[PDB]
Amino acid sequence: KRNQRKVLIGIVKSTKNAKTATVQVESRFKHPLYHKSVVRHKKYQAHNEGEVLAKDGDKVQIVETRPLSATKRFRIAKIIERA
Amino acid sequence: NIKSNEKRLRQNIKRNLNNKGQKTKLKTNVKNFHKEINLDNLGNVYSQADRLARKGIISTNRARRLKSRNVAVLNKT
Amino acid sequence: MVSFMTRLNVADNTGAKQVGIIKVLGSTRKRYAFLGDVVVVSVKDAIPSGMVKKGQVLRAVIVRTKKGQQRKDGTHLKFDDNACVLIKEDKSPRGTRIFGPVARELRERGYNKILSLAVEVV
Amino acid sequence: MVKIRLMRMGRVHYPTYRIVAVDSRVKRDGKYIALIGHLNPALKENKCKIDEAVALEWLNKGAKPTDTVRSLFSQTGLWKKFVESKK
RNA sequence: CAAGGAACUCUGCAAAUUAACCCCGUAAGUUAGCGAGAAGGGGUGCUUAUGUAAAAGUAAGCCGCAGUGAAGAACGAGGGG
RNA sequence: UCUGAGAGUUUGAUCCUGGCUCAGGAUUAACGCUGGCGGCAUGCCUAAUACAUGCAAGUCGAUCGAAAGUAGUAAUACUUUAGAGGCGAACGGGUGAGUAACACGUAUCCAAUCUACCUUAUAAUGGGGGAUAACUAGUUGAAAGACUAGCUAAUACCGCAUAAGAACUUUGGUUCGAAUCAAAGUUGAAAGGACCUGCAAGGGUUCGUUAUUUGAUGAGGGUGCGCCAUAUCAGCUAGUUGGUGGGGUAACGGCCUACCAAGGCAAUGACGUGUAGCUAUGCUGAGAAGUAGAAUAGCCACAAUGGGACUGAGACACGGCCCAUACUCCUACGGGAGGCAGCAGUAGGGAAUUUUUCACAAUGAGCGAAAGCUUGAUGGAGCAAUGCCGCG
RNA sequence: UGUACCAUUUUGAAUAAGUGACGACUAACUAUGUGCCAGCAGUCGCGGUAAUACAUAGGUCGCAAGCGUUAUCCGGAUUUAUUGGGCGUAAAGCAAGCGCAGGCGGAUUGAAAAGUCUGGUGUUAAAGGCAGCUGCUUAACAGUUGUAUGCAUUGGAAAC
């Protein structure tokens, strides 16, 4: 089983769009020449299958997959509890 | 212009006509299968698709996809 | 029957989209230019990259007429617009290509360069 | 068809070929997959050493030698270790 | 009233164009109210079906050169005193 | 283990802040002067401006018939293919206009893909039909031709028989949507050429055909991260966001479609502006790195300009087709033809960047069992002090 | 392509040198003429009747089949200061305050482990750069082998 995965913990902003949720990710990277460390946001997309209704504050995990549609590209893999 | 292109201009036309004639009879058989549904009609459709599946007129994956979507409506029962 | 101060289309590649009559030539009080008759004109609308700027005065040969004119053999040719070509003082157009059909009565007067460059003479 | 061909890597008047495992639809002296020894077809008396390692793999998963490559495959004994292991 | 379209003339005077309803679309400028119906375009007839409470609306079809088929409906743009 | 040089210049004179300039290399360089040779490399950066002219991918008779020609009394044998047919034509050449983005570098997944020639291995390479080039006759034009009616053969096409396993669904159970099994139903496969043998019967060899099972290979799709300036660019976007049914596509997918909702991106810079092919690399620097993307190589885009689609497995095709646009050329006024950013060469610009040169001898590619053919790819020669090096 | 090359092969010093500067920076100095005029110039600046700066002559030196000038890139330039700059008087602290976002932020214990460190694996085309070597009569040059770098993934560590 040689398919790869990107385990990136995110945060669900809003699923107002029907059965589709918006997740936010914070990757920490070193600035190329200043050597300082900064963390940036990059919103991602995963559609609600219906198992759990993620409200505000739900932070989950994401796995790769085929292109499900334009601007909707990844699917949920593992869900972590609220806070 | 170079000689070895207008010769191909002659050869292509007749097989273009032949392939169009085959494509349209595929299409009319498929229409026949929509207007009435039975095993015999779709079996004719399978055979007629496999005729071109031997050659490169229709892409073979197209043939399989269409016959799959036809067995899909066969599966109404 | 193109007359004095008659804006009319242009039928070559000089870029002279809209041109008006300024005087009909050949005699006093001509007041009419049938097929073939040479007129002087003044370009009132052109294309930016044209060999003739706006406001020049030039002589032109009419080719197409809306009113038409009876021909000798009985036929009566008639177009649906007014056209011309931009000649340069002997017989030759200021352009290289001619758009649309051109009448035949230009054959006798001269202008054989136009008929050579014409797409289809009628 | 992936073809074992010649690549004239060298100065003027001095060809110096590295034997190449390159596809048919590739120009001369272009990018390839694996390297096959080299050649200096001006110096004689075994100036034509070849790796013998991945060339046999290429032949065993599809490869087409050429006449100048036929020559090199002849003396070194590639045929007597290839066509018999074929069976 | 054919062709031309202000060449008339002291001046587009007079005459000519647009015109109703519905639908797109509307600039510069401004005292922020306006400009503005700005400008510039599209549809209307009949029949069936679908329309909803009526009708507008929508789909299909038919006819004529033409479908507020007649009658009644704003011609604008730019600059200046 | 690598390696870091300064100097002149504001003052009556001094220290400092600070700017300018020079001492070092490098060029797709050019200009002035001078100029002997050899070797190596390089030689439009301006106009992806327009082009006189010649050559740039054709091959195959052991595919076909037929034609022409030669030996032959004849039978026959040999040479070429105008045409039909096989492959090649999509590689190889050139240029960098466009493109600020999954275009490129790079790491990946394709449970989303396909891939003829090449590769392991298997089943068969049966029998019919109907057609058409060429030819002839005619119409018709100087020709390009075009059209009209008969004639043909094939490895051109089309049915038919049986499918080893496939292809797709039906049924049963297996494993962590994939894969494998069992049974059923439907369905589709060829082409023969040359040769040996064989009195024959028939058997076989080489070249060829289809269906199959691994691959090699190539192309395509998607994502990560990186990959310009500009806020004297604040909102941008309505197939845009998401779902449903269908179609479509090699495959995923608002890609399209009929229905529903208004959503989505955006200061961590959306949208816009201008800029630019990206990368390896070259020059410089000790270095962090600054800088151009030369020759060359991987990837990308293009073929007068703009669209469309056939065929091909692979093109939306640099010297294929249709259409339109612009330009040019030829003509017998009836009509046509073309797309030098291929190699040379011309015109213009520029200050400036070369021979209308030879050969497949070698690599190669393509075809052809084989002889062999084409190659302005390539290899060579001519020119240039343009650069590096050596010798006078 | 009789090609390079070889061969006591023929003759013969015969068949071949220019270029820039000379006040300093920066090695190289005298004379004649000109006399704020002609002209020079990268910077400082030279000449209004003794000019080592202008023009020439002689001489000298710096390169040399190339020498100079112009144009572009990096350096020197720490003159964009991450390595590697300052803000009283030399350019530079907003007139001051309340303050969202963001940046940074006391001590102690545990966990996870993104960063952080190290282990393996894969990968990062050739040429080119570096070093060795080989072959060109030797460098110019051609070729061989070795040589970095980054990323993904995987085993750990657990100071911060």
Q: At what angle do helices D67-75 and D78-86 cross, to 10 degrees?
A: 90
- Residue D34: CB less than 7 A from any atom in strand G: no
Residue A70 and residue D86: Cα distance in Å, rounded? 51
Q: Residues 6 or more apart from A22 whose CB is under 8 A from it?
A: A12, A13, A14, A15, A43, A44, A45
Q: DSSP secondary-structure letter at C91?
A: S
**Method used to determine the 3D structure:** cryo-EM
Name the token pair of D87.
């069976």
DSSP result, A27-40:
EEEE-TTT--EEEE
> Measuring CA to CA, which residue among C69, C71, C70, C101 is closest to residue C85?
C101
> Measuring CA to CA, which residue among A53, A68, A63 is closest to residue A21?
A53
Q: Residues 6 or more apart from C66 whose CB is under 8 A from it?
A: C78, C79, C80, C81, C82
Count of Cβ atoms closer than 10 Å to residue D17 Cβ: 21
Q: Shortest CA–C1' contact from B39: which nucleotide?
A: F186
Half-sphere CA count of A76, side-chain side, radius 13 A: 24
Helix (H, G, I), strand (E, B) or coil at D64: strand
Counting the structural domains of chain B, the total is: 1
Map out the domains of chain C as residue ranges: 1-122
Residue D64 and residue D5: Cα distance in Å, rounded? 9
The angle subtended at Cα C80 by Cα C37 and Cα C24, nearest 5°, is 25
Q: Locate tokens 């017989």: which residue?
A: C91
Length A38 CA → F19 C1' (Å): 38
CA quadruple C19, C63, C4, C23: dihedral positive or negative? positive
Cα distances from C47 to residues A44, C10, C52, D13, in angstroms, run 52, 12, 9, 60
> Measuring CA to CA, which residue among A14, A25, A18, A1 is closest to residue A54?
A14
Q: Residues 6 or more apart from B23 whose CB is under 8 A from it?
A: B52, B57, B58
Q: What residue has its CA nearest to the C1' of F362?
A: D15
Residues 23-62 of A with CB under 7 A from strand F: 27, 29, 32-33, 40-43, 45, 47
> Measuring CA to CA, which residue among D38, D33, D29 is closest to residue D62?
D33
Phi then psi dihedrals of residue B39, to 5 deg: -65, -40
- Residue B5: CB less than 7 A from any atom in strand F: yes
Name the token pair of B17.
């006509």
Q: What residue has its CA nearest to the C1' of F158?
A: B18
Q: Residues 6 or more apart from D51 whose CB is under 8 A from it?
A: D35, D36, D37
Instruction: Kindly list the partner chains of chain B, i.e. chains with 3 or more CB atom pairs below 8 Å.
Output: none
Range of the domain at B11: 1-77
Q: Is A50 exposed, middle or buried (0-12, 13-18, 19+ CB in 10 A)?
A: exposed
> Measuring CA to CA, which residue among C103, C120, C82, C99 is closest to residue C13?
C99
Length A13 CA → F239 C1' (Å): 24
Resolution of this entry, Å = 3.5
Length D14 CA → G90 C1' (Å): 68
Helix (H, G, I), strand (E, B) or coil at C41: strand
